[PDB]
Amino acid sequence: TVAAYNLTWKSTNFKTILEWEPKPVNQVYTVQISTKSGDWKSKCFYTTDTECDLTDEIVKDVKQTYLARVFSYPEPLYENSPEFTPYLETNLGQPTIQSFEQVGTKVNVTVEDERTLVRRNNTFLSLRDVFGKDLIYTLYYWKSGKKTAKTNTNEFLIDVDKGENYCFSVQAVIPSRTVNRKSTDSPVECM
Amino acid sequence: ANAFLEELRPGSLERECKEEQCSFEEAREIFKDAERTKLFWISYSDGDQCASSPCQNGGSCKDQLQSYICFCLPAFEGRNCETHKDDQLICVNENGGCEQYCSDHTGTKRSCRCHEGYSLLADGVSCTPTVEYPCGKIPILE
Amino acid sequence: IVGGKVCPKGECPWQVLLLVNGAQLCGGTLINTIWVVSAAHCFDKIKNWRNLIAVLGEHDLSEHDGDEQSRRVAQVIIPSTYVPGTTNHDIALLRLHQPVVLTDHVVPLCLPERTFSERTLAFVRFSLVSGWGQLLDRGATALELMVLNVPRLMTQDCLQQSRKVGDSPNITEYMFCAGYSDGSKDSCKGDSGGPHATHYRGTWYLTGIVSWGQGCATVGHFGVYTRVSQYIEWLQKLMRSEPRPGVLLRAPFP
Ligand SMILES: CC[C@@H](C)[C@@H](NS(=O)(=O)Cc1ccccc1)C(=O)N[C@@H](CCC(N)=O)C(=O)NCc1ccc(C(=N)N)cc1
Ligand SMILES: *[C@@H]1O[C@H](CO)[C@@H](O)[C@H](O)[C@H]1O
Ligand SMILES: *[C@@H]1O[C@@H](C)[C@@H](O)[C@@H](O)[C@@H]1O
Ligand SMILES: [Ca+2]
Ligand SMILES: [Ca+2]
Ligand SMILES: [Ca+2]
Ligand SMILES: [Ca+2]
Ligand SMILES: [Ca+2]
Ligand SMILES: [Ca+2]
Ligand SMILES: [Ca+2]
Ligand SMILES: [Ca+2]
Ligand SMILES: [Ca+2]
DSSP states (O other), rough: OOOOOOEEEEEEEEEEEEEEEOOOOOOOOEEEEEESSSEEEEEEEEEEEEEOHHHHHHTTTTTTTTEEEEEOOOOOEEEOOOOBOOOHHHHHHOOOEEEEEEEEEEEEEEEEOOEEEOSSSSSSEEHHHHGGGGEEEEEEEEEOEHHHEESSSSSEEOOOOSSOEEEOOOOOOOOOOOSSOOOOOOOOOOO | OOOSGGGGGGOOOOIISSSSSHHHHHHHHHHHHHHHHHHHHHHHHHOOOOOOOOOOOSOEEEEEEEEEEEEEOTTTSTTTTTTTSSSSSSSSGGGGGGGSEEOOOSSOOOOEEEETTTTEEETSSSESSSSSOOOOOOGGGG | OOOOOOOOTSSSTTEEEEETTEEEEEEEOOSSSSSSEOGGGGTOOOOOOOEEEESSSSTTOOOOTTOOEEEEEEEEEETTTTTTTTTTTOOOEESSSOOOOOOOEEEEEEEOOOOHHHHTGGSSSEEEEEESSSSSSSSSBBBBOOEEEEEEEOOOHHHHOOOOOTTTOOTTTEEEESSSSSSSSSSSSSGGOEEEEETTTTTEEEEEEEEETTTTOOOOOOOEEEEETTTHHHHHHHHHHHHOOSEEEEOOOO
């Protein structure tokens, strides 16, 4: 057997999946995840895949720092993964502008508060439910010159010249963050 | 798309990209500006990866740029919700839910057992003492 | 014990105190009214094999009370692979001359089945180590039973995280590491033979024995315990065997 390597975390909106190498040739794998002071919980028992969804475990407390190790079979050979703190590292999905209504000389651009994988009381919590104040959306629009705008909620109330038309784009951003502070730009929409 | 003579008409994102499929050029003609064209074309040309309907067992696919995300039903998990959280009654998975000893079995379901001094209750998972001082228990705390 | 706390009287009921010639020697773990599991190196220099005493229900080496029960050690069984002065196979099964009485202050620790211990218990982050050993490195022993919760590590991490020394002993498949590497908490010399008890779903099991280590709570070092799961069969087979003449008995292993 060959111990796994290059273990990488793939997470977006808390949908977290640990990946690794190489392409299993006579060896099966078993993953274990835990918190610095927790017990080790196994996952993806004897899988032949080089991936493992750990979403259900990490969403139990997105503020914890989980470590993971991949066990290799033909104590067994294993390789530890990088530490993973969901809340501080999960990638923010691509935003989607829900709409925008005009009211005279101002526009109300609304950001769709997408849902996350974090389960809470039989439902999926939204990005706002989780990050609360840590989350802001920035607007990059233009008169169909660049313009920006930031909001602490899921809406933008902006001034626009009557007659002229505008196109819009937004981004999810967790200012405090150091890693993955922004999501990719949402699809462009014009009134 | 480009029908005959329609190009004589100014550009409209609606008639051109919403109401029909618009190439990069048609889009570049509506937006004019390079960056504006590229910011639009990234999402416009990415293609909805949820088309394959990858999410299984009644999951829900949420499209992303060159990827998707599956939101599963309680009893499932895995990139595409292919994992049956009910099909994992083996001993290495949480000791098979057994209180003390677990014994896997080919095909069938695992069986639980207990240490000397204990017995298995009718739930087939728990153990209770059959002596006054079973091993592992702290009297002044029981 | 280093960096631990006192075990409230009665909350460490399987802890055993081993005395040789009335003098303190090592710790132990009672697993049934007749047998005690301890460390093998505790007998490297025993002369009077007829003077080994095992006390249960102990707590405060300074005050006697009726929870105390004494028994002559009738037999000390060490694996035939253990080598005095060394570290591998640091284990010993002791037969008491007379069975001890089970009370609220005297109860055995469960000897788990091999697989259950390797597959489950070994994955319980924390376990309890205790004894009347040194409270400090090269320090003086304790008067009241001390207890400490220590995290377990897989040998690979133990090595990777331990800084190599002048040809120290190998960490074999018959031992495992637990504790911290910052110099805050660990078991110690005088604790040798004491239990490394693991709590799991309402019951405590024997998973290790205080064996060896680089000093006590040395920065960049862990405590090493005998991996008991590796001896379950050895122990049960022996506990079913008939008593041997002398006290010391070297039984083959595997
Ligand atoms: C490479 C040298 C080790 C083998 C040696 N390291 S040491 O630093 O010399 C120990 C030490 C520490 C403090 C004062 C005196 C000695 C060692 O550990 N030797 C064995 C006996 C070998 C025998 N068969 O005679 C020993 O002393 N075991 C008791 C014990 C139990 C628990 C711990 C702990 N939790 N850390 C540490 C030690
Ligand atoms: C559906 O489309 C996605 C695109 O990435 C692909 O990964 C799936 O395999 C397919 O079923
Ligand atoms: C999408 O979300 C998943 C979890 C299920 O609730 C589906 O019914 C829904 O369409
Ligand atoms: Ca057209
Ligand atoms: Ca056209
Ligand atoms: Ca048309
Ligand atoms: Ca239309
Ligand atoms: Ca053109
Ligand atoms: Ca055109
Ligand atoms: Ca054209
Ligand atoms: Ca897409
Ligand atoms: Ca006393």
